[PDB]
Design a protein around this ligand. Structure first.
Ligand code: 8WW
Length: 154
């Protein structure tokens, strides 16, 4: 029992783009751009769709960099999140109803105002390593169990 989601990180040589989530799931935390994958689109098409909806950006190419599975206590469906990276983007990011975008220097990442699992795997993304992760949550703040490894194929 699982459902597909996407997450996109725009990572340039000296900065990374994050959005402050204004409503819905994860509101009040900085994150990459993404959401549910729809019927009739590929996983990559869904990532591009969410990036455009939430920031206005389009891209030449997306690269697969990780997979993370989330379990929330008392929720029947696991979340299967496919994580993508890009350097080159097309456009200037703008605010949407869902997200307020800002650039961050790579030594000033706001981990205290991010999902707690990001402190574990985001460092691997910044180091350009591919990864598989699993995190079990009780509510939105408490990690009960986790696994994390580097992989050769995402
Ligand atoms: N960084 C991060 N992201 C997510 S969900 C990302 C994808 C998403 C899904 C549904 C609505 C909008 C966005 C997380 N969940 C639990 N820990 C987490 N960490």
């Amino acid at each position: 029992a699982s459902r597909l989601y996407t997450l996109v990180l725009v990572l340039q040589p000296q900065r990374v783009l994050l959005g402050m989530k204004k409503r819905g799931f994860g509101a009040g935390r900085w994150n990459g751009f993404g959401g549910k994958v729809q019927e009739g689109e590929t996983i990559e098409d869904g990532a591009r769709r969410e990036l455009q909806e939430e920031s206005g950006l389009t891209v030449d190419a997306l690269h697969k960099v990780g997979q993370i599975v989330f379990e929330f206590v008392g929720e029947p469906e696991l979340m299967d999140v496919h994580v993508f990276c890009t350097d080159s983007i097309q456009g200037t990011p703008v605010e949407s109803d869902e997200m307020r975008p800002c650039w961050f220097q790579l030594d000033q990442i706001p981990f205290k105002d991010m999902w707690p699992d990001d402190s574990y795997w985001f460092p691997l993304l910044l180091q350009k390593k591919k990864f598989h992760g699993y995190f079990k949550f009780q509510g939105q703040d408490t990690i009960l169990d986790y696994t994390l490894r580097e992989v050769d194929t995402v």
